[PDB]
Amino acid sequence: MTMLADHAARQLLDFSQKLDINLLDNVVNCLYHGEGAQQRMAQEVLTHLKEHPDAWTRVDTILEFSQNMNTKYYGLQILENVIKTRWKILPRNQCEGIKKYVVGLIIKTSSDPTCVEKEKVYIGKLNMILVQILKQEWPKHWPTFISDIVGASRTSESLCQNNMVILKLLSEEVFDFSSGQITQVKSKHLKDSMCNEFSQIFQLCQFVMENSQNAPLVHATLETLLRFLNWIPLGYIFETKLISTLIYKFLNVPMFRNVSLKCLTEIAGVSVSQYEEQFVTLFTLTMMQLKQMLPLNTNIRLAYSNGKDDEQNFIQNLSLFLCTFLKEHDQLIEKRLNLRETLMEALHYMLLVSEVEETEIFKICLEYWNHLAAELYRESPFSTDVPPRRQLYLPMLFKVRLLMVSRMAKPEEVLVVENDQGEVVREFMKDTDSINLYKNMRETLVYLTHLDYVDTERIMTEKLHNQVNGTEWSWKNLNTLCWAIGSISGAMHEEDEKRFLVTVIKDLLGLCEQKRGKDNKAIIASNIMYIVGQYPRFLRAHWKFLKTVVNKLFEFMHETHDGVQDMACDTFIKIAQKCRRHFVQVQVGEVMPFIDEILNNINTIICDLQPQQVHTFYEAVGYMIGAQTDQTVQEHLIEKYMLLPNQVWDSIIQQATKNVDILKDPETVKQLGSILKTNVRACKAVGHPFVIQLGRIYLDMLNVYKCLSENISAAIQANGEMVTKQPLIRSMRTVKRETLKLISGWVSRSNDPQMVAENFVPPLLDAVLIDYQRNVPAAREPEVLSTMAIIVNKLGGHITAEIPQIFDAVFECTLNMINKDFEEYPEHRTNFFLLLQAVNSHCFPAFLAIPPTQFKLVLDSIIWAFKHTMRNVADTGLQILFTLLQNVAQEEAAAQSFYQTYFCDILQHIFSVVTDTSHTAGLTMHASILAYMFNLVEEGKISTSLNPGNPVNNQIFLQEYVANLLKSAFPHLQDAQVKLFVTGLFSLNQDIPAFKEHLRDFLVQIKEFAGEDTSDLFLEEREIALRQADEE
Amino acid sequence: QVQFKLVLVGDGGTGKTTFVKRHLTGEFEKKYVATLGVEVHPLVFHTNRGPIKFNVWDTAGLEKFGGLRDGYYIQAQCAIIMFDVTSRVTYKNVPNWHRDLVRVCENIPIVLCGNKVDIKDRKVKAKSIVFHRKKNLQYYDISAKSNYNFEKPFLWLARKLIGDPNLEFVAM
Amino acid sequence: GSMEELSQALASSFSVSQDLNSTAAPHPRLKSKYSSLEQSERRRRLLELQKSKRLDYVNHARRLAEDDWTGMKLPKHYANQLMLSEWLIDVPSDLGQEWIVVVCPVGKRALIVASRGSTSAYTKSGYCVNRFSSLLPGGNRRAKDYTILDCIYNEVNQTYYVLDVMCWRGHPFYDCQTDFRFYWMHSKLPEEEGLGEKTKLNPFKFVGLKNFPCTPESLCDVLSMDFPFEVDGLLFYHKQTHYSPGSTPLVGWLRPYMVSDVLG
Amino acid sequence: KLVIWINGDKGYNGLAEVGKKFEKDTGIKVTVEHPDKLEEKFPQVAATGDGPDIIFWAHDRFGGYAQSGLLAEITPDKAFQDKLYPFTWDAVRYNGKLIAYPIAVESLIYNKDLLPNPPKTWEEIPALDKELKAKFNLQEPYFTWPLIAADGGFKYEKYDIKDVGGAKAGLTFLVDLIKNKHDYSIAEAAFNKGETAGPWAWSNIDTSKVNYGVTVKPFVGVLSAGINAASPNKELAKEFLENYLLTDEGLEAVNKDKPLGAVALKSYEEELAKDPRIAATMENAQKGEIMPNIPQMSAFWYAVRTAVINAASGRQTVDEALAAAQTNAEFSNTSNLFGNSGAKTFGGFASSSFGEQKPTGTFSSGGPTFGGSPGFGKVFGEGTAAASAGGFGFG
Ligand SMILES: Nc1nc2c(ncn2[C@@H]2O[C@H](COP(=O)(O)OP(=O)(O)OP(=O)(O)O)[C@@H](O)[C@H]2O)c(=O)[nH]1
Ligand SMILES: OC[C@H]1O[C@H](O[C@H]2[C@H](O)[C@@H](O)[C@@H](O)O[C@@H]2CO)[C@H](O)[C@@H](O)[C@@H]1O
Ligand code: PRO
């Protein structure tokens, strides 16, 4: 703890006698190699010490006498801190001292080739220190620096190498990472300085590249050139020998090929009209070099698979170069016949690279393939009189179709996930990298399919042939093929699609009969179903076939093989969603709609299915019932639909009426949970008309909820927290949650706020809300709050009147759980502020209708919300505050009183958040608020804040108030800084990104001690910008 | 002890600590109690070629609690940069973690993880994630909550360090 | 034409399990290549094979009870453990003297394994639907009392209606006949008291399913009499049939209304 | 202030007599309350803050409060455990931690004018009724257990809850005594004024002074003092209990108004060992049994109480109620009745904040934290490095 930490820190920082390097080395070595206690404390001590305002004073000694690299490095961290924050207030002779010690040490170390065996790591840290110094005083106090080092590079080769590293780092700090670390204007200034003095350095680099035989030096030079390519003027790139020098002297030699190719890729990324020929040159030469190191006769898939890290890196870098260049400049090479062979080679390369089994590389390639297919599609969207660009790519397009069909990713991603409770459910991932991959392959293949229907159907038919004759037969391969077949659904004309499908399912059925073994047959059947389910147009077109299919599904719902039941249900819910009407209406050759038949055979259909599969089934049928429009018929359908679960439900409710303690019976609670899950799924499908069922069980349901709640609560009271880990309480909480889910689920899809408000809302008040209030802290289900939010979001005006009593049950008691820290009871913080957001957004008059003393508590709850380190809570908090300000602006009666009451408190709390590093995520919101608020002060606030209203105008008062507040909060700030910031608040109150940047600037300024009269805040550029923004 | 040093970096509220803890205990932490400086947890996997130990340096991603920062990166053998697919900022901050990291560790295997892919409102789309490409980093969508692609980072790193691309994890 | 061909082919010959006259599909009176009218001889041949038992049942009950498998006309791993019937189509003429009938309640078929402290139920597919405490041997906490039962779970009555037994406290009954198993089961079941009652130690009531002879009078009787459950259908066992997991003609199946058109 | 909850039949007058000594030397007021059924109210009132600082009852209920986190863990210095006997400490022990201080061990009371001779068993007492008639408590399980555990009584092999009791032979025989005529204020009214043949009712035999005497299977209920964990007075309570109560004086001042019987304090128990009553009351513990301190006990107590009322004259029997009492042994109580929606919706219904006064009258009244305001000599170088530090560029 800070006991040992403080003690050791003080021992090291006493300053009354010689510093214990032995001890420091020991603490450091403990940190890098010690155990959790010893290491904890070492960590504590080192951080603690590093913080101290005078620790830097000892760094020189640390660098002078310490023998291990780690301690030196630590000392450098100590130094870096001072330079970063207190450099402008050190006694200047000390600054000079640090400058000399640092560049001197860098000379002595870098001018030793031992630097490698020496501490490369350590040297990087040194150079970084120098770059920090430069950042703090260049060129103002170091105007000859670039000349000095560029000149000193001609001295030694090692010195030059390290100098290249320094320049690179400086480039990174000035151009790449200046945002958030350097103020906007200072950043612009440094960028201008470097851009100005670049030609000198570029001459250095050109000299080194053209002449040096030193491999480390050359490499460092190239690595530096990479960043410079990130920012330098295009003349240096496209009007010098650079591109050539890279391709002829460096691209082919192994140890330089990667960096060289990366440089080339950066250059290739540039989109500029004037250097067409240079670009062509770039491509040609690059290609001619590539073919030497990666001949087109290479199995790039194997070459990657077996290959070492740099080989792999080179293949990836290659794919990047070709993809980049082709995407930005394909047109250039297209209109040059003399480049055909090269273009082809490039494409050929791509194809080879595509066969590589590595999803990242393949995504890189697929990016380009999708580009090409998209382009050719926009050129002309018609099949095989021929467009020019397409005619250029005709020799290889079918290879791309073949690639898409052959390597098609899985369409959906199913995942076995165990709930907050025990249950292992199947979770379908909705938006992931893999599904994105699939969607992109599908997109490309659809493009290419439109370009040629014949070629696509021919490819897939050949693949299927190859499945039948066993040449390419594998579960994986069959799956992939069918995934492709389904992926192009809708891309063909309906009659064509039918003609193609008939062939597909006929041959797949044949293959199913043909193969022997239940495994193979199961896989084939699964794929057949998948394809069928992906082609609903076909099913809708032909009723007899659809009926046949569905009957087959029902048949396979008994199949003992794993997967077949799952697939049967999954397919069934697809077909149900996409062909719902065909089950409600009477079809030709039928006396009754299919739904009646299904409902008449439900249990026989689902007797062998597991619970989750049954839910899927009920959901699927639920869609069919939703499809029936006649309210009466639909009501009867819903009634028969929910017969079986209602029987068990009724039995249990009866048992409970006779005796409540069966609600403590494990299997009973399980049954309840299952029944409720069925009701939820059903409700999702049917929608509003499900009310007839909901209303039927509603009050009973509420009762059981209550009971179980109470049960759970006591279980806490008796056995504390731990008791919430064993099966029973778990399954009970499950029942509560499914109850809430059912309620909010139906409310969300209810198209009558009146009825909901009068009927279904009042019982909740005592059944769930007052129960929530009644429960023990740990017993309270957070999912209550959230559900209420939903209801509010759905009702609004129809429930405003009820907002008070709701707040009686949940608000007060929930606060006390979440106002002692920011960590405990997270789901409650989340859901609570969700509810509060809902109320403020849809039922603001309720706030106008509640006592002031309580409104203070609400406002405080909001502030408290945006004070959170939890991202979503703070986010919602800021949103609420914004919409609340707007809401108040709407009601002109309360507006002035509200402003007069809370304006300054809000401002100061917000400012306390903005100046905090841990809240930067809400920057966009912060600005948006302050801007708005400050805008309001320009013309929309009639009353005056202080008694002397006349000497104290709104804007004036603000300016001096915010100024004094920030001055007292941050005493180390300068008057000019603060005044400039505060006028920046008014000047930019209609330019949000600018305001945001202004805030980032202030955030950087408050973290470093400028001190007295040191003015590198560039008031002219700043006040000019503020002026121009003020004009608009 | 055939063990490796893994450094885990990323913004605050990203999922680093929860991820490691779940890999340890098996539970899933609901609370956000920010890491201070660094917490190192030994974490073992059983491979077909014997056991392997990752000493995970769960570092703090809040600037306020940064601690020794890069100091923690010294002698690291591999790394996991992590961000939140529900917070675009955490992703835009990845190049910072990467620069600070690769300055101390010039040549180590690194995996970029998009965490919290279980949450529906995905802000950082898979389409937008490309930083690793030019940096030759390995990428994975993961979820410390629904356990999606839970062991892929450690598996890829293990393969890279050991040199056996066909290495696989086993029960015990 | 090609579409009629397709639909017809899909209905007729699209099968994974590939068993004849499967109850997974509706009655063949409405033709699959997996639809047959020649049950008779098949039954005889099947019974001929049972006679020379060349399979290891004891060990199998052991594997089921303690979940242990090893090595390479029998299944393993909790799936496909139940004896399933064909549709009753080719009625045997030695019916009334050699065929029993069981009236089957509406419910979900379940393999029941009581062992090591607990009882577990499985679908035909091997999915463990539930684990509960039961008075059945090996079903309570209170390591060698294992029991394997064939059941039909009725949700309404919350009752596992025991259709058949395959193991009771170590001793297997795959080796025995249907009639002897029915007697043995129907004797061991009522003589264990609370087993048929909702205790804390046993929440699910286990009840034996009454079986009857198939004399033209007895059939009118069983058709007439009431039952404590919604009748799903009728299962006509052969008296000597060993318990053989998977589909078989040695037990037939019929809907209640269909019986009126089967010699009575 | 320390607000004490204690039973009414005990010496709640003497505890105040000690509380005045505390009040004189401490300044803290000691209000010794006696509300409606403390053993039920104490665990419930802790839900909304209210409740006593320290509690007094037998150690059968403390087990329930202990796992909850209501009883403040006490760690008295080892010099204080020397004063009280080890087994009493074992009586209040729970999970290896002390939740309460052991105060006093809690016999046969009779009129010596009517029944001088002592029966060594219960079988030959009823027959002697017919003599006097011609010329104890009924509802609680506390008083009716002496014979229930005479023939055969949570068995200790630790108290396994799946092993509860025979209990029939002892209860039925007593019932037959109620049927042939061979509760609290009705029976005792006869004991006091000499109209019939624990130590919490010994001093009451004074104004009428019926000739008393203790003679020879009850409950050994160690009266204990538990500190509440929700109270701020955790340190001040143990001051009171160790230095003012468990002493020569304190326990004496409590014993003076109404005897405690056998007490845990060594120095004060050996003074009272000469006493016939206290020597014969610890004798009841020799053939008696030490009472469990677990959350599984309370259901048992209530069950024991119900089986006994209807056994005499009601709508239940003994074996019929023992078959149910057997099964009455996780959560003691939670919910009681299922149909309560209708009960609530037609009830009185109270009101709460956000539902009373006026909003558009005022907006402001008078009044990282919630509700708070926002929180926001020698130059460095010397040696080779500084020297070599002329600059990259030279002048
Ligand atoms: N939905 C979802 N939430 C997650 C997931 N992983 C973590 N979280 C939540 O996000 C928060 C992450 O907290 P930590 O893991 O401590 O954050 P950290 O990355 O260690 O942040 P620092 O300690 O500041 O470095 C926790 O509140 C988790 O509940 C996930 O996969 N899905
Ligand atoms: O170790 C199991 C093996 O089987 C599966 O793949 C094979 C299958 O074994 C073959 O019989 C044939 O059907 O080709 C399949 C191609 O998927 C598993 O998918 C595979 O991982 C595994 O090697
Ligand atoms: O997930 C799918 O769609 C494939 C179909 C056959 C088995 N798996």
Ligand code: PRO
């Ligand atoms: O699957 C079952 O258990 C019953 C048997 C006859 C048909 N359905």
Ligand SMILES: [Mg+2]
């Ligand atoms: Mg952390």
